[PDB]
Paper text:
The recombinant cytokine NGR-TNF, carrying the CNGRC tumor homing peptide, has shown a higher anti-tumor activity than the corresponding wild type cytokine in animal models, thus allowing its use at low, not toxic concentrations. This enhanced efficacy is due to the CNGRC motif that, through the binding to an isoform of the aminopeptidase N (also called CD13), selectively expressed by angiogenic vessels, increases the delivery of the tagged cytokine at the tumor site. Despite the large body of evidence supporting the vascular targeting properties of the NGR-hTNF and its vascular and antitumor effects, a structural and biochemical characterization of the interaction between the recombinant cytokine and its receptors, TNFR and CD13, is still lacking.
Single crystal X-ray diffraction was used to assess whether the CNGRC peptide induces a preferred conformation of the N-terminus of hTNF in the NGR-hTNF molecule. The 2.65 Å crystal structure of NGR-hTNF is substantially identical to that observed in the absence of the N-terminal extension, with a rmsd of 0.81 Å for 373 Cα and 0.95 Å for 2701 total atoms in the trimeric arrangement. The N-terminal region of the mature hTNFα (amino acids 1–8) and the CNGRCG hexapeptide could not be traced due to the lack of a significant continuous electron density in the difference maps. These findings indicate that the N-terminus of the NGR-hTNF molecule does not interact stably with the cytokine, is endowed with very high flexibility and can thus attain many possible orientations. This study superimposed the newly determined structure of NGR-hTNF onto the crystal structure of the lymphotoxin α-TNFR1 complex to model a possible geometry of interaction. In this model, the N-terminal region of NGR-hTNF is positioned between the three TNFR1 molecules, allowing the preceding peptide to extend in the solvent and thus interact with other receptors. These findings suggest that the N-terminal fusion peptide does not hinder the interactions with the TNFR1, and could be available for binding to specific molecular determinants on the cell surface, thus modulating the TNF activity. Taken together, these results demonstrate that the addition of the CNGRC peptide at the N-terminal does not modify the interaction of hTNF with immobilized TNFR1 and TNFR2. These results are consistent with the determined NGR-hTNF structure showing that the N-terminal region is flexible and does not modify the hTNF structure.
Residue numbers in the entry:
A (entry chain A): 9 to 157
B (entry chain C): 9 to 31, 36 to 105, 111 to 157
C (entry chain B): 9 to 107, 110 to 157
The structure:
């Protein structure tokens, strides 16, 4: 109660895309924070803890080299441009699975978190490059949240 | 002080289980049945880290899971709040492998809610780096 | 805005070392927190959220086994002793790539709440600075905030 806060989760029913839902159990979106165009809107200036987690899953390793990225960006009203705040890269595959050997699943989580000075009207986005590898099987694996401290 | 807070660490002497010791734990938060009990409603930052370690890669595929669950007073049943999966071995071999998992998020908790932080492979836990397998909350 | 806070990022121009800068772009260091000797100084006692991230990168796997560590330590004023707060280990390479080397990425994120004293100094260190990746700001960071 009181402080601006949000904790949104990926829509498990949206295949191959990262769509944040707020209307779920153990999810938050109150005290001015809005979810518009898949982005969190800051209702007032202050110091905010921003964090997100994504979980990637793939069946075996393909011929091409896979890079998984997760990025939290800020779109300021003053600029109206996307600026990266937190990002990370992961590479699940060192070799393509030998032809004839069984394809084994791989899992790669990425967590991002930090405190930033935000202005009223700033929009925050948490995006990945490979939504086709996203894993929604279990609740609590893909989430995105902020809170004014 | 003031607000409920807890920071418990894994018992390195507990074989085949993830057992939290009763050493931060103040301002109403209790540790009973290996679970943190919420003393009052409010917004809580929940976080946990586990460290997995193995001396090699087996023929079969190993899945490491870490999960923070909630047992709400209103909805009394185990519900996932934060969870993650890792696969340490892509190919069969002996060289050691290391896998950390960190979880963190803000949630609205009610008085009497019980929080658990659990793993599936306690035999792969790493206690070399004492104090690195932990589970904590703090009301914001 | 009231609370002691810091969010510093790695210097991209410092080769082979982890040097924290207090920048003009989304980096914080206000309300008493100081950056001295590449170390964050706590201005007042309380519970602090501490977190850091590093990103390691290598252009293949070497003959020896690589262990990547990231560690947040505390240096108390009264003791001046080093206490480990947060650490993690990762192993990017299972076998040395036999002679087409492909790049690998391994990030390490740390986070926890700790009771800190006025004047305590916090350090965020790695063991393999030669594998550090600075291309994109916001991939190597270190921050605290009193809760």
């Amino acid at each position: 109660s009181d402080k601006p806060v949000a904790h949104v989760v990926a829509n498990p029913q949206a295949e191959g895309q990262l769509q944040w839902l707020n209307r779920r159990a153990n999810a938050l979106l109150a005290n001015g924070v809005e979810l518009r165009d898949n982005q969190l809107v800051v209702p007032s200036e202050g110091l905010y803890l921003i964090y997100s987690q994504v979980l990637f899953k793939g069946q075996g390793c393909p011929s091409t080299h896979v890079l998984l990225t997760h990025t939290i960006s800020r779109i300021a009203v003053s600029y109206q441009t996307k600026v990266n705040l937190l990002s990370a890269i992961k590479s699940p595959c060192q070799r393509e699975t030998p032809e004839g050997a069984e394809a084994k699943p791989w899992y790669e989580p990425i967590y991002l978190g930090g405190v930033f000075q935000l202005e009223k009207g700033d929009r925050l986005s948490a995006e990945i490059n490979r939504p086709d590898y996203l894993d929604f099987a279990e609740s609590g694996q893909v989430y995105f949240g902020i809170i004014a401290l």
